[PDB]
Symmetry: C4
Subunit: 225 residues, 4 copies
């Protein structure tokens, strides 16, 4: 025999939850001001516990009235909600307290799934990645090749930018965004090894011919259907 499955889908419930979130998006933006932080310390503690408990019972009521161990877990969205709330209860203890606050901010991130207009949008934004699934592998192979070539070439001439396979993977990401790729990344080096203009000029051409052909691929694909 069923039960109160007719109120969790009521319109006087979504608005309650969004009001709660928006209040939590404010109580967590406010507590970044040390002045008002210490002045109302041990109040944020309580109100955080309250909001956490309300959210916990909230997902609970959204679980019982949704085909128990059947469909509630068949969706990714429900898993996202339950994951955050459970993560709230998990880390609550004498630990690296800082990782507890980021979870509160992510609670405000949950406002994406309780606004049916946004949930559908982010679904559309996520189900376009499988389309550009090959260009991304081709972009990763070239990122890797250049990250190895740059490391074994500019290791003892600029250890800040090309020091290891990771620092030189970061330098290669600053350059695809064309951020100081020449004034800072490539001018000092091109003074030591003069044939190095070939590395950066060939990378900026290839790495930008692939990016613009990913962008065009999405334009064509989305317009197609």
């Amino acid at each position: 025999t069923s039960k109160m499955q007719k109120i969790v889908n009521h319109r006087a419930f979504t608005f309650t939850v969004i009001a709660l979130i928006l209040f939590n998006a404010l109580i967590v933006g406010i507590e970044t001001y040390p002045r008002i932080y210490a002045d109302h310390k041990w109040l944020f503690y309580r109100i955080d516990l309250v909001l956490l408990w309300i959210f916990t019972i909230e997902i609970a009521m959204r679980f019982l009235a949704s085909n128990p161990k059947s469909a509630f877990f068949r969706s990714s969205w429900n898993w996202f909600d339950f994951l955050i709330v459970a993560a709230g209860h998990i880390f609550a203890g004498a630990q690296f307290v800082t990782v507890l606050r980021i979870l509160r901010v992510l609670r405000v991130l949950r406002a994406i799934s309780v606004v049916p207009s946004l949930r559908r949008l982010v679904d559309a934004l996520v189900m376009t990645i499988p389309a550009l699934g090959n260009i991304l592998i081709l972009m990763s192979i070239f990122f890797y090749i250049f990250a190895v070539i740059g490391t074994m070439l500019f290791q003892h001439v600029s250890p800040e930018y090309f020091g290891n396979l990771q620092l030189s993977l970061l330098t290669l990401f600053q350059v695809v965004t064309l951020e100081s790729w020449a004034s800072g990344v490539m001018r000092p080096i091109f003074a030591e090894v003069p044939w190095s203009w070939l590395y950066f000029v060939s990378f900026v051409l290839i790495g930008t011919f692939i990016i613009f052909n990913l962008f065009i691929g999405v334009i064509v694909n989305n317009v197609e259907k």
Copy 2:
């Protein structure tokens, strides 16, 4: 009984007004040269008063011959004109005189509405925002989440960029435009907290995957109809 509603829509009136504006766009660009400013001081005063009065009577003649208290106020454009001119008469006094000059420059902005070719264009440019009304909320939620996370993480390590919820909202806007996001914003910080490359690299990827999907959304939408 009607009156001279047949001259405000005459073509020998729009050209008069545009001539007046273009003259005011010149008399206000010229007065930014202190040399010629002081040398012809107390002349700009008079000519400003003249232009203001002509503009005032101008909107008046555009009001009486346009269904009195009926349609003249039903449009946004007419409200824009009347608002500027009234703002001219409002602030004229012994006050922060500098806020009076900006109103003159905005008088030249009014040239958008008296050129029927431009008015229609800006109407089309404004009535495309409701289309991208969801992507903007999704972009604002992520701006806010990252502005709070960055503030409560990089507060005592770079107070210039992430000092409060607002300074760190400005830093996060410089980074979406990819302006010195790594050379200046993220290199000094990544030296203090080494795991911070995750903050900026994840933000530049997410915040740019949303922007390019807003741009594509507009391309698809406008091409659609």
Copy 3:
């Protein structure tokens, strides 16, 4: 009675001219090396005179066999060629010799019109400006408004960037390209007048919402037909 109009349109003539240009594109790129410049001085003088004369007779033969004072001047392209060559003969004298060399380089620019594949392309690229003829006026009005507002606001706080109506028109062009608009242009100023983040943030949003709507306008228009 007609004459040799059947050789200027011969295919053994375009190739001669392109060979000449490509040789002039080399003789003018080579003379920028002072070493080989002085070492073969007074040779470049002669060969320049030769090439100039050949080009002059070349347009002459392209003039006589093309409906004398009828259609030869009805086209813009022919005017472009004749203008450059005449400009070559005009400035040749005891003058600011430097303005003579730029004319040689522009002779190599003439290679656009003698390659029928390029001439058609640049025609298509030029006859799309009348399409975006309104967005450009709307972009110019906003450039001007902000150039005046910035000048009468940031004149005595950063005379390098906003000194007059022109220096502040240049600063406003560096910012639409998002080049150091915050690290260099807006950070020093935002320290003097704190409410100035409104100027640059509002300009970067408006000036980029118009540019992307010009780009989209061209995409839609060109795809349309």
Copy 4:
């Protein structure tokens, strides 16, 4: 009489080769850590020789069972593979050893052709260049003209940026990407020769009106068919 042409196209062969490559993409990324490099020196030597030999016999088996001296060489892809492997055997000697390592990294680049999903993609990405074959010539002519004009104009005022026809060809490439084109490239110069704002402002407008019309050309072309 034919032979074992039925195993090189077996699906238990492509996976073997990709496993080998992915292992070589790891053995070459790992050897950029000097710590683990010297500690396991003279082991990388052996394993490199092994992988090289396996790859050599691998292309050999892909050659014999593919119409001997007929079609194996009619394709560009097969030439690419054989070229890399032969280049591996070629340079192996008492020479500039550094050019030997880059060949290993390029062996991992070969993973593009043995993944039928990628090979087709890169074919599509390469057969779109003939489409934009005219815009590229028009872009090269303007790059060259400006590279000569800038060199013969800003030679003795900024020898770092415009020193010769090549250094000024590099400066002109940093500017089309809008990287520090004003803060670094054009501000110091505009202080010496004041009319030089014309060079950079006219170049950034022309060189960006051509790039955006190349991008649009590809959008239109790819959407067309």
